[model samples]
Each structure stands twice: as C-alpha cells, then as structure tokens.
Target chain A: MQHHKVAIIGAGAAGIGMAITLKDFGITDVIILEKGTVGHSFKHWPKSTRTITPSFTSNGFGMPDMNAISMDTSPAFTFNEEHISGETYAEYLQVVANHYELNIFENTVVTNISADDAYYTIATTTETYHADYIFVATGDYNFPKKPFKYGIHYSEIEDFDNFNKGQYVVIGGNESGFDAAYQLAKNGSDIALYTSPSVRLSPYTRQRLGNVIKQGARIEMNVHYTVKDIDFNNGQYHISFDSGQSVHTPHEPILATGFDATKNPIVQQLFVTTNQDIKLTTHDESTRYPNIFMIGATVENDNAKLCYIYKFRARFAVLAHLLTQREGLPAKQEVIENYQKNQMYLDDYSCCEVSCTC
Target chain B: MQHHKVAIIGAGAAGIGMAITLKDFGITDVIILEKGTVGHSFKHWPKSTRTITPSFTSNGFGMPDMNAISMDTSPAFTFNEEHISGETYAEYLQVVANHYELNIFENTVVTNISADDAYYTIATTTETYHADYIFVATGDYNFPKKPFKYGIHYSEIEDFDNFNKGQYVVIGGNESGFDAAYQLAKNGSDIALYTSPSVRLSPYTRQRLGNVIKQGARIEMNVHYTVKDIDFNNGQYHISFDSGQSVHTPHEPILATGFDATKNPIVQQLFVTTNQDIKLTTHDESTRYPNIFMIGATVENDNAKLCYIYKFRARFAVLAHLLTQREGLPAKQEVIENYQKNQMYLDDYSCCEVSCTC
Candidate 1:
C-alpha cells in the first residue's frame, strides 16, 4: 500500500492549485492521481473555443490574471495573448506543474475510494493508495448533465469544423451555450439557441452574440424554453418546449446543458447532497466523511458557486491552512499572508455577493 | 471660510474612491473639490482611445473589474463592454458619484495650499476652504511631460480623424504611445515610434502593435533612441537622437511621453521630492506636511507605482482606516474586512512584485 498525507483525485486546475498551496505550507506528503494528463479537461475543449475570461498580467498588485490558477503565474503572460485557447492554456498548466515539481500520476484513474477510521483507501486501475485525507478536485467537465439522450453534449465536441455547415439547435443560453452558438455560427452554420427563462445572459455573452449577428450569422435565441423533450428521427433532432413550441434541425442538437458532480459515482458515495447541492463545512470538507474535501467548479457554499478559476483558486489556501493546522504543523504565517494578499486565501463569504450599482 | 474634516482635490477615480471609502468608514465630514466635472481627465481622452486594461464584472469573488475604482461597481457592467471608452467610463464614474451621494464641487480649482499647526487652508479659484487633511487626488493626465515643444502631446488630440492622413513620428513606446500609433494607423496615417532603450514593452502593448502591423499599417519602431533635440524648420519637424540618427516628419510628431505631478504647482509645494520622486509615508501622507496626502497615479511606495485604478484604489481603505483611527471613531471592522477581501485594501508590499513562472 502506498501511503501519503493527502491523495488528490484529478490533476486539473483545482488539483494543481491545491497541490502547490499545500507544498507552500510545507506539506510534501501528497499525491495527485489523474485519469489523464494535467489540464486534461481543458485539452478536450473544442479547437475553436477560447476562454471567455480575459487574461492580463495584473499580478503583484493583488489582481492576478482572471484565468490564472496560481498566485504567481498568468496564462496571458505565458501565452502572450488576452484570450487563450484550450491547448495553449493546457500547455501553461503543464509548465506550472513542471516548475512546481508536483507529484502527479498521469494515466491513473481512481476506481474506488473507501474510507476507514484513520485513512482513505483509493483503488486505482494500476495501484492502490492510502492517505489520511482525500481531496476531490475532479472538476465537472467530465461528468456533464444530460437532461436527455437525443443529442451530443458540448463536451463531446472536438472541433466545430468537424460538423457540416448547416442549421443547428443549441440547448442552454449561458456561457457555454452562447459560446457554442457563436462558434458554430462562425463556421458558417445557422443556430437557434433554446434556454430556460431562469438563465440570464451575461453581458459578455450578449456582446459576443451581438458581434456574430452583426457579421450576418443567422443566430436566433429562443428564451423561456423549458425543454420538455428532444426526439431524434432520421438524422434530425426535434426539440419540444413547454411553451407549446417545437423546433427541428437537420443536425444533432448541441447540449451546452452544464455539468453536475452527482453524475460521478465517487462524489455520490462520499458527499451528502442537500436539495441537490453538495453539503460542505465552512472549511469545504465533506459533511458526511471526515478528511474528504471538495474543490473546483461544482463547489457551492450558501448559494455561491465557485465556477471560475479565479473564484475557486481563492479557496486553495483556505483548505491548505486548515489541513496544516490539523496536522499540527507550524503555521506558515508568511506564506498564508502572501496568499491572502495575492487573492488566493479568501475565507470571508460576505464579499461573495456580486453587486454593481453602476 | 468653508471648512471640512477632509478636502479631496479632484473628482477623478482616486478622489471618488477615497471619498466613498471614507464615507463607508463613518467619515462623512468630507468634501471633494474638482477643477472640472467628475472624471474630467477621462473625458479629455481622444475619441478613439479606450482603456488598455480590460474590464469584467467579477466583483462577487474578490475580483472586481480592472477599471473599477470602487469595490462594488464595474465599468464593464455599466457599459456592457470589455474595453471601455474614456467618455463611457466618465459617465460610469458620474453614476457612481450620484449613487454614493458624494459631496462634490465642480469647477473649483485649488490654486494654493498652506498648512498651519491645526489645519490646512486651501485657496481655490472661486473659494477658500480649511481642512484637517488634504488629499491630492488631482491625477497626472492634465500635466504632460514635454521634453521639447516641437510636437503635440498625446493628450492634446481630440480625435485621430482630425489629423490629416500623413507620416508622423510618435515618441515613447508604452501604453499611450502604442495606442496613439494604432489609432493613427487606423486613420490611414503612417507612424514611426522612437522609444528609449530602457522602455520594456508589455505583452498587451506588444499585441496591439502586432495587430496594427498585421493590418498593413506602415509602422516602424526605432528603439534605442535618446532624444537630443527637436527643431522645427522648413515646414517640417526634425528630431535628433543621441546615436547621431535623425528623423524628419512633415506632420507634427506625437509625444506620448507620460505625465509628471511636478507640473502641478500645489503638488510641488505640498509633497517633498526625494531624487525627483514624491515622498510619502506608508499611509500615503506627504512626509513634509502632516495632513497633506497624495493619491492616484503619482503615488509611489518603495519603488512600486500605483499607476492603475485597481492599484491605487487598494490604498483607499488603508488611508480610510488610518483616518478613522486618528479621529477616535469606532473601528468599522466589517467594512474594513469587506474591503480587504475585495482587493480594495492592500497593505502588504511583498505581493507588489509581479512574477510569472510560465
């Protein structure tokens, strides 16, 4: 049995960030088990997709790049571009992993995790590991929410160029949905987006859609659509909404219908779900299991979701500090203060309300 | 004579931010005196000019928009654009001032300031006021640093469309210089940029220059140029460099040479200059004057220049906290903590060094 202080599942942004923060706090007995390579989810993104969040080398003045996973690194500074592609961002993550010398095991998938009184036994495809703590940093990209099985999910897309130029129906009107519609429209395809009424389009997404529309891309947004059913027959997808409206497309409908952590069996077994939301303590530890923590996009506390890299990365040092204290290690006050100053250590929840009077 | 606990000069980003922070700290005995309307300098920016720093409404997660002066507001959210224009940003500031209900007097220029044992008397063009403390928030945009008088400063241009399409020289190679060159090229004008050897171009600036070049803009960068003199003769402006190189232009060259606070006589008298740099205490108060303080772009501490709104805005809470303490007011711990969590309060200088490993 391979034993360590901590076993972090998934080597994505959350995992990598947590690992670096732990190392900074003098916790070296850590192992990162990844089913794929570092930034695996990012590498799987469509070639035409770029980060919607703009990146700038604004670090050192308490404002790091929006997409930066660490306090000291910037994807914009690494790629020399404001909006970075998935491949380029993945390369940046790889560079950061190498620079930090994180103990990451690639091509190793965790088959199961069983917790005992003292340790968590993680069973992988090739090996088994025992650790006092388990950090579920496996991000939400792999486990996408599939409301129905009529069309392909957005995550299944490799490139928009692979699809023929034709009319397409896009489900969901948030960031990913608008992004899919815009990218497909750019490829000379007409798009009709159907979204729930609750989905409020961000200004950023609206701006992108407006630009594509100005460029003569035939894109229609059908808001207030509660997708009742999506039926596919003879190479066409027929989408029916609760508003008694129906739309059909020659091509398969694109499901930009976000992701859910409950789809992951390990997550379902370990964490308690309350009102379809994962339950975590103030320290982000699993309410059901001790020493089992969660980080990344799916993390929600008091209705505040940590969806963006900048948002989730703020809690890295929070977990690191708590773990260090539990292990009876000397408090690395300087390192914690540095992280707090650099926008990585955020424990205050009062500032989580997004308010802009202007 | 009009009296106040604090009198802030200028209603720009710095002044507005400082006033709002003070108000939040229960320091309401404050008044803002502006030579012009709020955000006056921003309104003076060229029609084609936009903020180089991209803005996004990421306020809820401890990350406010880059161009935001206050922790709660975002220019991007107000304008629904990433790169906000000067006039649009000014309007946003006006909205903020209205929302905060800040006491401001427009068209009141401070001509002189003299400190007594108990108070500082401020003499403006129209009225005089006395204050326990004076905040010099008169930003640097109106004070252009002209080494010679052969060309117009970048700030003097109202619009690039006003300039005839012709070959022109642009001095300096930072943000403003690159912006000037790009705007000029867009208006069908060829440009030659001469920069000092020490000016290292940021990635953002370099990206803009590269984009203009790709559009077939006739732009040339003549680096390592130490301007010796600029002599106007024969309906042309001739520029001499220290390398014995010379360039002549039919149109008046554009001086993107940055701004200096020394040009403002009040700043010259109030703030002590050490090796040509303004001297200030850790709280940003002038070293020579007890209650006179400097804010905005000209503020410097330990070689770190607070040139950006995000950078300078971080000090607003620091000053507010100190003032509240000095006035024997109850510590607004919640307000201070909220500001600290939102990147509006930064006292740690160690995090001021911008570093990126990848």
Candidate 2:
C-alpha cells in the first residue's frame, strides 16, 4: 500500500473547508476517506430548509463568493431560500474540491484504524492507506441500533411526512423531537411532542415560531407524569409512560432521543485510547484524539447547542491545524483559548427551552 | 362664479388613486387637475439603476394576490425587485388610472383658491377652489435645484466616510438618479445632488425614505431645465464635464434629479376647488386621469399606455371592468396576467446614464 502524509475522513462542511485551508497552507499530500458523497448530511434535509443564521458570512477558505450568500423569501412565503439543498450543497463542495483538487476516495468505508509510532494505519473496505497525521471528520448518527434498549425503532420514520394533519404522538421533547413535531404541524400534520424526565429546547426556535405555533399547533407539558406502557398492534402503536396515562399514535412512532457520539462504532474505536492531551477527552480544548475528530450535533454538550452541520467548522479547523502545523500560525494554546470564547450557534455549551407534554 | 357641480383640474396618479377614484361611484360634484402623475413613463430604465421591487403583496379590488412574485439573483429573489426606478413618468395615467379611479379634471391651473362656494375654497398662488372632496398627498420633493448651481460648501468631509461611491451627477435619471446617489455620498457636509433638467420627484423619495431621511441627508434632484451655467472656483469648485464640458461641484457633489409636483403652484393652490389629472404622454396604455392607475417609474411616460404598478386589488377591478367594458377582460390570457411580479435591484433609462462628463 502506498503511504500518504495525512488521511482526512469524511467530505462534509468541515472536511471540505479544511481541505481548502490546508491547501492554502501549501500542504498538498492529503487524502479524504468518504463513506458517502460530499455534503451528504445536507443532501438529506427536507425540501424546504434554510441556513440557521443569516448575514454576510459562511465564506469558504478560498472562495470569496460564498461570503455574500443570503436567503430569500417571497411575500407570504414561509420558508427562506439559500437553504443548503442536497444538490446545491454538493455542487458547492464539488466546486471547492475542484478548486483545490483535494484527493478523495469516494464510496470508501474505513473499517479499522490502528496506531503504532506517531502514525495511524487506517484500513478501508476498498483500500489500505497510511498517514503520519489523521483527521477524523466522522459525524454523529453512526450505528443506529435496531431494537434499541427502549424497544423503539428509531429509524422507522425517514423524516417529516411520516405523519400528516391527523393526530400523532412523539417520544422525547428535546430539540430533535420538537423540531420534528414543529415541522410535522407546519406541513399540515398535528402532533403531540412527548419527553421524559425533562424536555429541553432552545430559546431561538421558541421566539421565531412562537406566535404561529401557538395559534396553530400545541405542546403537551409533563408527559412523563402520566406515561404508562407500550402498545404495538397490527400497525399502530401506543405509548404508556410511568403513570397510569397512555397515548396512541399512528405507525412509524419514533423516539427522537439519545445522542452519544461515542455510541458511533467508528468514533468509539478511533478514540478508545487516551488522547495526547491525557484529559480523558481529546485536545486540551478540542477532542484531540490521535486521529479521530467529532463534528455536527455531537460537538454540543446539550440539545440546545446541537445545531446540525453547524459545528462542522470548529472541529474541522482544529483537526486541520493539528494535521498541517502551518508556519506563522497561531499557537495551539491560542487556538484552544479562541475555541473557548467563540459562540457558534451549535457550540459545545448552549441553552435551550423545555419541550413538555402538558 | 364659474361653478356648475364641481371644478377639478389635474388627474395625475395621486390625484386619481386618492381623489378621482373617490368621486367615481356617486360623487359627481368634483373636478380633477392635470399635472400628469398618472401613467408612469420611466418604464424602461438604465441598465444600472433598476428598482427594488418588494415581494409581499396586499389584497386589492380586482385581482386575487401576487402568486407570481419570484426572486431574481437566486430562485429566492424576484425580478420585480430589480433595478426599476425613475420619477418623472407621466405615462401611467391614461389606462391604469382611468381603469382604477376615473373621475378627474385635466389641464386647469389654480391661481388662488379662497373660501368661495361654501366650506373652505382652496386659495392657490394662481387659482381658487371650493369642493367637498379634498386630499393633500401632494408629491414630496417639490424642489430640486442644487446649491452648487449657486455656490459650493464643504466644511463637513469626515476625511467624511460615506457610502455614495462614484461621481455625483444628476439630471433626467428621475427619482432613481439622485435617490440612489443620495444614499451613497450623503455623509457629514460631504455633498449635495445637482440636477440640470428640473422636474418633480416625490412619491418615490417619500415612499422609500419613509421617515429615515432626518439623518444628515443629501437629496434634491429637481431643477428647472433652463439652467444658465456651472462654474468652478478652485479644484474644489471646478465646474466642468469631461470633453471639457462642465458643471460646478461642491467640496462634494451628489445629484437628485426630477421636480417638485407642488412647485406647479397650481396643485398647491386648489386643495378645495377641484382635483387634477395631468396630461401624461399616453404611450404605455395607462391613464393618469382616474382611479385605476400605475405608480412609481411607470408614470414617467408622457404616454399613458405602457406603465404598470405593484398591482392593487381595489384599483385593478376598476381597470379590468374598464377593459372588459371595452374588450372584455382577456379572461384566459394567463394566470400571470393577474399576478404581481417582485424584483430586486434598481436601474434607470439610458438618458439617466451620464456618458462622458456632465
């Protein structure tokens, strides 16, 4: 097998932008391990979506046009345009890739990664690659256990539309569950967002869709107070919580809860050992494992900060610096301190609202 | 003495949308004045000075809504919002105004409108008036002469930071010429707009500026076309165009072209006498005399058949009926016929573009 200087994992927002930044620093010997296509997460979003934030920003490392991107919504229109679609986002990644000619292995899955000296020997189904430095741009949502501990099929529903204007019940009142319920009602489907122990949501979504949702949709507070048992019939299902109360729902009843990045088999295997910083975590600030890095909602400590695709940049920059060590660059301490301050919408620590079944 | 039922003079746009339409149903005791603010004439604009068309729409008399509103730069932005501005268009009066609200008085000027018939007769500097229907939405910028035409002053230049980039030259560009330019260079005592061919430019300035113009502003594009000359004192007041052509410049210069509808002295004279519908050039199939008419740049045409508007419901019904009365509302022409288009940028006609140096 041929040896390479560095092996970059995943071709997403952070992966793609890091490739460009690294190229700018004159480091050309790099290879990307992509199990899926570029911007795979963005591609899977609903037809109507928009950037979480607005204004003049989101510029890639080398592309200037990206700096001025903004969304558009016509009169009486609900959704904003400039939302990253599968095709549109992929196209942008393609442009970025072509701009710097980042070497990438498509449709390649990394099976195992082992480290000896300071390098990591990464093995993929299709190829064997060696690298002195490794960048793991792996996302969350890996290894979705079928027949999970709660006996809930987490993957039954593809997205919204699994429910319509009819009555439906969702388990978990966290961000994802609330987001799902909100989207369901927005698309004309009514819903009851359910959560146990506590339902935490962010203040942002609460304020933006507050009035409209209040007028049209509804939220049930303190669902766990009356929850009973599980009812699985021919096709429909019912949820019974701790109390004597219970609720019935249509097929594809989902449990949008539980997020542990380490639950991902690939991430667990890569970072199973203590990292260089010996902090029981990764970097002094970042999760500085030998090769692996985490991105997306996983980077968040709470649901309020679990902004999808929003945390990619921060993780990617740290990974890139660790891989390249470009000259005249800021010290690792500075980078760690800077990471300590910047407040990305989906950063490590964030605040959210409570989602409850009243 | 000269009063039968009522006597109004001008049937321009505002005069029609506000006054003429008021008298169309049963109020026969009224007259319209013709200063031609009806059909807009500045329909065709310069390549660079397009208008900013808003996407949202309100319900009007005839049509349903603007389902056709679309974006320009992105599928999210609309073409209607694109560069379509200019002020001196009388072209919209004939068709649109006649169709929306067609009860007007054309071509008569008021000298001194006193308390004549009974109530309060409008005493103008020129004519007199006495009536029941009276409106005071007289176009805004009633004056457009430049101070540089008299002298130059520039005690306020930040080293004066400003947004008004490029040179400041004003003339036939209408509201767009000086308005856009006004926004660019009007910081501190930086500059003032100067116009050669003088005319009125209101509706637009007042409409766009709403109430935000109080901040150390730079406006005024109206001026009589009989300008004698422009001279320069030092490099500061150097009054000259390229090709050796010239006009005096202040320490800084801007150009807000168009006129003062109130300066007609006739419209300002008869508030109570009668309404007025100016004789706009009838080229855009629009009418400046009555209820159903176009606004903004479309009214600049001396011709009335070509101009269009943001499409109001209350007024469009009047127009469709007029068209239906004459040739039947082309029922199945296309759904687009009834939809309003929204654009993004702003541009002006060729004359608005100063070629060499003027």
Candidate 3:
C-alpha cells in the first residue's frame, strides 16, 4: 500500500494552497490526489465569466493581491490583467503548483475513503493510498446543486455565446445568477431573472447588474418568485412559483442555485452530516472523525462561510500549524509569522466582522 | 494669527489620511489647508480617466482595500465598483472627510511660509496661521511638468471626447501617456505614441495597451523617440526628437511628461533643493527644518517613491508616532500596533522589495 504523511484530495485552490503551506512548514511527505488538472473548477467556468474580485500587484506592503492564493505570487503580476479569466486563472494555479513543486496526481479520482484505527485509506480507480491524516479539499463546483429537473445548472453551461439569441429565464439573484443574466443579455438575448425576495444582493453584484441594464440588455429582475416547480412539456419550460404564478419559456431555464457538499458521496461518507454544514474544530478538523480535516469553499465556522479564496486561504496556515505540532516538530515560528503578516493566517473570529462606516 | 498644533497643506489623500491617524492617536488640534475643495487633484483629472488600481472590500482580514486611505473605510464597499472614476473618488474622499470630521479650509491657498524659534508662520491668500509643526501634502497633479511648448499637458485636457476625430501625438509612454492614448484612440482618433527607449512599461500598462490594440485602435507606438522640442508654424505643430526626426500634426500634441514638485514655490523654498527631490529623515520630517514634515506623492526614502496612496498611507502612523513622542504624550501602543497589523504602518524599508517567483 502506498503511504504518505498526508493525503489531500482535489488539486484546486484549497488543495494546492494547503500543499504549499505544508511544504513550507517542513512537511514534505504529502501527496495530492486530483480528479482533474490543477484548478479544475476554474477551467470548467463559463468562457465569458471572469473573477468578480479584481487583482492588483500590491504584494510587498504586507498586503498580497486579493486574488492570490499564495503569499509570494500574484495572479495580477503574472497575467497583468485585473479581472482574470478562468482559463488564465487555471494557468496561474498550474504555475504556482510548478513553482512550489507540489506532489499532485492529476486525473486520479478518489473512489472511496475508509478509516481504521491508525490510518485512513483513500481508494482511487487505479491505486489505493494510506495516510495518517486526510484532508478533504474537493471543493464545491464539481457537485453543483440541481434541485429542479427542467433546468440546467450554471456549472453545466460552457459559454453564453453558445445559446441562440432568444428569451431565457434565469433562476437565482446572487452573483452567479446576475453574471449569467448579464452574459446572456449582452449576447443579444432577453432575460427574465427570477429571484426570491429573501435574496440580498451584494453591492458588487448590484453595480454589475446596473451596468448591464444601462447597456439596454433587456433583463427583468423578478424578485418576488420562489420557484416551487419547473415542468417541461412540448419543448417549453413551465416554471411555477409558490405564489401561484407560472411563467413559460421556450428554452430551458438556467439554474444558478449554487453548489452543495452533500452531493459528493466521498464527503458524505467521511463527515456523515445530515445537511450541507460540516462541524469543524478551531483547527478546521472534522469533529466527528479524528485526523480528517476539511478546507475550501465548504468550510464554515460560527456561521462564517469562507467561500472566497482569500477567506479560506487564511485557514491553510492554521491547519499547517496544528499539523506541525502534532508531528512533534518544533513550531516554524518564522513561517507562521510571515503567513500572519501577509494576511494568510486568521485565527481570531472576532476580527472577521466586515463593516464600513462610510 | 490663527494657531494650530499642526497645519497640513493640501487636503488630498495624505492630508486626510494624516488627519485620521492623528485623530485616532488623540491629537485633535490639527488643520488642513486646501487650495480647493477636498480631493482637489482627483477632481481635476480628465473626465474619461479612472484609477488604474482596482478596489475590493477585503478589509476584515488584516488587509484593507488597495485604494483605501483609512483602515476602516473602503471605496469598493462605498461605490461597489472595481475601477472608480475620479469624480466618484472625490465623492468618496468627501464622505470620508465628513465621517472623520476633519478640519479643512477650502480655497485657502498658501502663499509663503517662514520659520521662527517656536513656530512657523504660514501666509495664505485669506489669513495668516502659525503652527509648531508643518506638513507638506500638496500633491502633484496641480503642478504638472510641461517641458515643451505647442502641446497640452494631460492635466489641462478636461475630456478626450472634446477633441476632434483626427491624428494626435502623445508624448511620454508611462501610465498617464498610455491612458491618454487609449482614451483618444478608443474615441475614433488615430494616435502616435512617442516613448523614450529607456522607459519601462509595467505589466498592467502593457496589458491595457494590448487590449486597446486588440480593439483595432489605430495607435502606433513610436518607442525610439526622445522628444527634444516642439515648434508651431502655419497652424501645424512640428515635434523634434533627439534622433533627428520630426513629426508634424495639425493638432496640439499631448504631453504626459509626469508631475514636478519644483513648480510649487512654497515646497521649493522650504526644502531648498535644486530639483524635485526632497530630503527627509527616517520619520519623513524635513532634514533641514526641525518640525516640517512631508507626506503625499512626493515622499521618497532610499529612492523608494511613496507615491501611491497605499504606500504614503503607511507613513501616516509613523508621523503620528513621532509627533506624539515629541509632544510628551505617552505612546499610543495599541493604535500603533493596530496600524502595523493593518498595512498602514511601514517603518522598515527592507521589507518594501516587491518581487514575484512565477
């Protein structure tokens, strides 16, 4: 049986970030198992989609670029673009992986994970690996939540230009939904965006939607609809809301309903949660299973969902510090301090309150 | 004469940032004198020009937004836009000034300054003021460097769209030059961008120029030209280069030759330098004058130009610390530590080296 000190599943931002942090902390015997290439989720993003977070080469003054996954590297400095495209971001991830020389096994999918008293065995299609510690960094994009049958999820769409110039119905009113509507409308397609009244739009999304509206994209914001059922009949989609109202569209409605961690069977079996929330300790370790940890967009502590790369990247150092202590090695104080200085380490939850007075 | 504990010239980013720091440090008897309203330099920017640095609301994780002058305020959270326009940015500055309750005198231009044993007397157009300490924050936009005749400096042009659709020559190949060229070219005008061979284009500027080129803008980058002189005859402007070549155009050439501090007679007399460089101590105070300090875009230490808001804002706390110590007040350790935790304090110069591995 192949064995290593740590087995990290998935090679997206979290996995690569965690692997780099571990290597920096003197933990060399680590291997990452990925079902696809590095930054696989980013590669699957729609062609017209770009990161809402802008990137700048503001690295030296204790503040790294907002989109950077590591302390020393900046995607803005590498690509020279502010709003990076998904393809370029995937390339950036590959570059960072190569620079750090992380041990990553691409195209190796984890089929099942079983744990004994001493080690957890990760079963892949071709081989099996055993490690003392397991880190679930599979991320959320791969397991998109598709609650309705008559619509396609946002993750499944390759490009907005692929659709014909016609009217389309888009569900959800968050970032992804507004992005879909904007792209589709910009491509000469009329859009009807259905969002529940409970959805609170961020300022960034609101500004973007405003720009698209100024461009005369013909997008209607139907904010009172809570979709109850989506029925397809005779080449048309019939969307019914809980308010007893129905709308018909010739094309299939697009679902920007978001992703779920419960959809992944491997995650489901390991953490064994009833819903999407996974209980984690302060160190981000799974409370239900010893030596099993979770990192990435699915990580939540005290109801703070670390969905952005910048938010979740802070936990990389937390995990690295605890793992180093557990391995009986002296604390890498300099490395940890550098991470703290660069905003890559966040242990205090009280300071996580994001508010602006002006 | 009206006396203040500290009199900071120019109510732009540096003055406002310094005022906020002083107030946070329990120093309230400070006054900021401005020739115009708040953020006067930003108000004078071209109508089509926007900030090159992008803004994002990443303030809670020990990293403030790139364009934020204060620790608690973010322009991104206020306006919800990545690339903010100058007009909107001026509004943001006003909002911050109001929130902080900074003492500012608009339209009060400083004419001269003379020092005595205990105080410096500042002579303005309206009134005379005496202060124990003087801070020069009169930013650079008002004093543009126009080296040649028969050309319009970038600061003089209100809008690029006001120009007729014809061929225009843009001198200087730095950020402002490329910005002018991009704006004019995008407005259906042909451009001849003459740049010196020694100029180095940053990655961000390179990407922007590439995008404008991809948009089929008729811009020709004449990189070998070292502009010598410009002469007008017969309603046409002829520009001479050091390479013994001249270009003739019907319109007045655009000059983006950067800004100079020597144009301000007060800054020149107080610092007493032959050129634009101002010498300062470790605390950014004037070496010749005991209590005169300098901030804003003109501040430089060890050839490290603290021109950007993010760079100059770091020195605010440094000045506040030194002032507090000189005033016989106990050091505000908590406030200083908080500034260090954020990227707003930079007393160490060795860590200012910006580099990338990939």
Best by DockQ: 3
Predictions' DockQ, in order: 0.58, 0.02, 0.60
- Score every model by TM-score: 0.93, 0.43, 0.96
- In the range B136-158, model 1's lDDT, one tens digit per residue, is 99878888978886879999999
Native contacts recovered by model 2? 0.00
Q: In model 2, where do residues sit more than 4 Å from their true spots?
A: A49-51, A55-82, A116-118, A144-159, A162-164, A197-204, A211-215, A218-229, A273-297, A300-312, A322-358, B1-358
lDDT of 2 by residue, B230-321 (tens): 55567655545334344555443433333344354534443222233333222112232222223222234322211223222123223333
As a whole number from 0 to 100, the lDDT of residue A352 in candidate 3 is: 74
Misplaced by over 4 Å in model 1 are A116-118, A162-165, A197-203, A232-235, A273-276, A348-350, B116-118, B164-166, B197-203, B274-276, B348-351
Model 3: per-residue Cα lDDT at residue A184: 88
* List of clashing residue pairs for candidate 3: none
For model 1, what is the alpha-carbon lDDT of residue A101?
Answer: 95
* Residue B24 in candidate 2, Cα distance off native in Å: 63
Number of the top-ranking candidate, with TM-score as the measure: 3
Error of 1 at B189 (Å): 3.9
Between candidates 2 and 3, the one scoring higher on DockQ is 3
TM (chain A) per model: 0.95, 0.69, 0.96
